[PDB]
Design a protein around this ligand. Structure first.
Ligand code: NI
Lengths: 258, 247
C-alpha cells in the first residue's frame, strides 16, 4: 500500500467554490467556534477567510457559517458540504487503492464502485458483470451475462417484461446475487454439465463445520465464488484443486442501476 | 441546476502525481499514439511531457506509457478520473437537496432510489430485536431473516439499520390452510388481488398493508381452489430471503 493524498476542487458557475483550504477553514471554524481563531488555525488571514465564506455563500445560494446563539457555527449546509467533500475524497482514495492492488472490474463504473465500497448482501456472492447478446437466435426466458473478463458466461432467468423495466440490453452493467447454499461444487464435469450454469475455478479456501462445508473459489476474472455444501459431499475437497461450481439460472437475483 | 464540476489532484510521497493536465496528456497520448503529438495536443512542451511521465512512473512504482500506448495501469488511472466525472452531477444533486436528512453515505444516497433488482418482492425495512428480525417500512409486518452473526456484522445490522429485503416470487408459498401456514418461519396474511393461471405456473398477487403487493408464483395444481378476493397466507423460510445494506 501507498495511500494517495486526495485534493478535490468543487466549482460552481465556472468559479472555484470549495478546495482543500476552504474546507480546512470550515472545519477549523467548526472546531474552534470562531472565524478569527478558525482562520488562524487553518493558516489563513481573517480577511481571506471572510472573502471565501462570502463567495461560497453567494455561489451556493446557501449560508455556510452563522453566529451562534457569540460564536460561529456551521449551518446544516456547511456540515453537509464538508461531509459530501470528505466522502467524495474517501471514494477517490478507495478507488486509488483498487488501482494499486488491481482487480478486473472497470474503475470508471458507478455500479462497480457501489459493489466494492458500499453494498453488502447476506448472499455471499455479489459478482459484477454485463448483459451480452443472447447466445441463440430463438428467444428464451433468461438474459445472458459476461463476467469481468468479458468471456465467462452465465444465464439468469428473467421475464421479458422484468428485463425491460431494468434496462437489460446489451452492455448494461449488473450485479449477480446468489446464495452460497445454492451453488454446488464438483470434480465431476458431467454432474455440473446437467446444470444451467457451470463456472470453472480453483479452490482458494475450505472450512468444514458439523453439517456444512464452505468452499471459496477464484472465478476466472478474479472475483470470488462462495458455496456451502453438505460435509459428506465435501469429503474429498481440498485447497488448490480444480473444480467446477454449478447452479440454476433461477437461483440468481440481478441488481442494476435504473 | 447550476454548472458544476469537480477537479481532482492526487499526491504521492508529498509530491504531485496526477492532476487534470496530466490526465489530459495521457488521453492525448492514447489518441494520437505518440508522446510528442500528445504533448502538442495537450498544450505542454515535449520535455514537460516526459517530466510528467517520468515522475508519475517513479512515484507510482508502475509504468504508465509503453512503446506509444497507455499501459493497463495508465488506462485504469484515466478510469479513476472518469468515475468522478460520472458521479459529479449526482453528488452536487445530493449536496443541493435541502429536504434530505443529514448525509451518512454518498454511495448509499446515490444508490437508494436507482438500484433495482429482478426480485419481484423488493421491500425496505429496519432491523429490530441464526437470524435477525426485520420490520417493513409499513411499521407492522415483521419478518425473520436467517443470517449468521458474521454476515450480520459485515452488513452492519444494528437496531434500526435500514435494510433492503429481496424475495423471488417462486420462493413464496400460498396457503389457505392455517395448519400449513403455522409451521412456516414467516407468515404474511393478505387478500388475493389477482390470479393468473398458466399451463404449469400460477402468479398470485396479494395485497400487503401499504398498497405493497406481494407476488408469488405457485405450481398450478396447488392454486386450483384459490380465488380473487380470498384472504390467504403467504409463507416462506427465513433462509429464502436475501437482505442487503448500503454503507
Ligand atoms: Ni442465453
Amino acid at each position: 500500500h501507498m495511500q494517495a493524498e486526495i485534493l478535490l476542487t468543487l466549482k460552481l458557475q465556472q468559479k472555484l467554490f470549495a478546495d482543500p483550504r476552504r474546507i480546512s477553514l470550515l472545519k477549523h471554524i467548526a472546531l474552534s467556534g470562531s472565524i478569527s481563531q478558525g482562520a488562524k488555525d487553518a493558516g489563513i488571514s481573517y480577511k481571506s477567510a471572510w472573502d471565501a465564506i462570502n463567495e461560497m455563500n453567494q455561489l451556493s445560494e446557501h449560508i455556510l457559517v452563522e453566529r451562534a446563539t457569540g460564536g460561529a457555527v456551521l449551518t446544516r449546509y456547511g456540515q453537509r458540504l464538508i461531509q459530501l467533500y470528505d466522502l467524495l475524497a474517501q471514494i477517490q482514495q478507495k478507488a486509488f487503492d483498487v488501482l494499486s492492488d488491481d482487480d478486473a472490474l472497470p474503475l470508471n463504473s458507478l455500479l462497480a464502485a457501489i459493489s466494492r465500497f458500499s453494498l453488502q448482501t447476506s448472499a455471499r456472492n455479489q459478482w459484477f458483470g454485463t448483459i451480452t447478446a443472447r447466445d441463440h437466435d430463438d428467444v428464451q426466458q433468461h438474459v445472458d451475462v459476461l463476467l469481468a473478463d468479458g468471456k465467462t458466461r452465465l444465464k439468469v432467468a428473467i421475464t421479458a417484461q422484468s428485463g425491460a423495466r431494468l434496462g437489460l440490453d446489451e452492455g448494461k452493467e449488473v450485479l449477480i446475487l446468489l446464495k452460497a447454499p445454492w451453488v454446488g461444487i464438483t470434480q465431476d464435469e458431467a454432474v455440473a454439465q446437467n446444470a444451467d450454469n457451470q463456472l470453472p475455478g480453483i479452490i482458494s479456501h475450505i472450512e468444514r463445520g458439523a453439517e456444512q462445508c464452505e468452499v471459496l473459489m477464484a472465478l476466472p476474472d478474479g472475483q470470488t465464488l462462495c458455496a456451502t455444501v453438505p460435509v459428506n459431499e465435501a469429503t474429498s475437497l481440498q485447497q488448490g484443486q480444480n473444480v467446477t461450481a454449478y447452479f440454476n439460472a433461477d437461483s440468481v437475483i440481478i441488481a442494476t442501476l435504473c
